[model samples]
Target: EIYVPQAGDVVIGLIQSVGIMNWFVDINSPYVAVLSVQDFLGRPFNPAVDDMQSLLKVGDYIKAKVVAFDKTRSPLLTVQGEGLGRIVRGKIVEISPAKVPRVIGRKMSMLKTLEEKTECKIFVARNGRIHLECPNEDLEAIAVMAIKIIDEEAYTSGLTKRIIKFIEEERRIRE
Candidate 1:
């Protein structure tokens, strides 16, 4: 199912093209979103000297929020809020948006466990992109694989225990 975006929903988008005053982003929906220079830079742009492509280019990924959207127009995205802007690092784990809550787990229990065991910083976005950053690539891979495992084995009993054991075993193997 396509994502029916609503205002205030945080989304991860890839810049499809850079324009003079705006950017076309693919937010994994039929509705391609637009990111204006005003919201992205949070300031006015002077066409004389400022080049929009200098800030963002095609294929760049950003974490932003839907500011305005309806049937009449394409969705508007903004990177003005805290923790909302260009994503320079981390692995963007793509999953089905509908399964995001399951990936998050109850009260963020699974999320906390994954972070603690993997020693990684994870951001579960409203969209299906879960950004994970770890001190090393090995740890990142472990956490990423763990996430994929959970994503596949979710809605099952005792999965958390299994995941904990799996992480420990993986760490032991790495040593």
Candidate 2:
């Protein structure tokens, strides 16, 4: 009925309610998210009444991934492979939904900065969680903090410079 999403894991959920064209799913996470039929299918196959029920009903555990977040602040689950549908199975930690913007940054600038400094690739899921890959553990740690800083001050300008400076200072103190 309700469960948290973990990375690299596929979540099985039941369809709670269906709207005009979207379906509400209970992924057993802190919140129930939407799984639109449009996103569920890649090609096109007009879903009939039985088809809808067969694929997802009021009580069915469909496997999906926490691919993105909706404007209403709900997780957008996907059953497709790759993109947003592939199952993510590792560890899933929840962050403040408000911080999502900061994590994504304006045109992804913050993430760019983090990547440059940490030499890590970071992907921000719409669901307010960050996907990170760092060659060095230390770099990954710094990247996480720097990203958090930007999120804390997203409304302000010149955040990139400040974050860079903060990372530099931390490096100095450690050395």
Candidate 3:
């Protein structure tokens, strides 16, 4: 499936390079996105006075939005929206971006279940990256497994029940 991002769409991106005034981000699109410090910080940015590198370094994952796009230039992205920022800490799980809706379920039902059962806080990105911060490594593993299962078997029936059972079994075994 072709993924065409629109303005106001939240996307997961990887910081590829830090420039003098703009940060190049890989948003899993045909065109790389430019995250300008002026847009990201929501204020005038003086590269010489401010530390753009410290704010967004290469290889860092971030949740941002498509602010503008023109065929003439790379897509413009911003992290100034609500719940948009750097992914500082968590276990990242990558899957097909197409499967993100299924993993999230309707109105985030599946995500809520997974977080409740595994005791984790999940930050799902539209670009198929999932960030999970659990209470412990074991719980994180469980959450990862659950997410993988959803990614693999999302089309199957009784998915919610199966996921609940799986988490229960895994928790029992760990205990």
TM-score of each: 0.92, 0.51, 0.89
Model 1 pairs in collision? none
* Order of candidate numbers by TM-score, starting with the best: 1, 3, 2
lDDT of 1 by residue, 1-175 (tens): 8476789989888899888889999887778899888776667977877655778888788999999974667999998887888889889888877768877789998889989988999888787888898878888889998888887874678887889999999988876
**How far out, in Å, is residue 46 in model 1?**
1.8
> Candidate 3: where is the Cα deviation over 4 Å?
71-73
TM-score of 2: 0.51
Which ten residues in a row are the worst by lDDT in model 1? 45-54
Pairwise lDDT winner, candidates 1 and 2? 1
Ranking by lDDT: 1, 3, 2
Cα lDDT of candidate 1 equals 0.84
Q: Count the backbone clashes (under 3 Å) in each candidate.
A: 0, 11, 0
Model 2 C-alpha RMSD vs. true structure (Å) is 9.4
Candidate 3 or 1, higher TM-score: 1
**Sequence-dependent TM-score of model 1:** 0.92
Report the C-alpha displacement of residue 100, candidate 2, in angstroms.
1.5
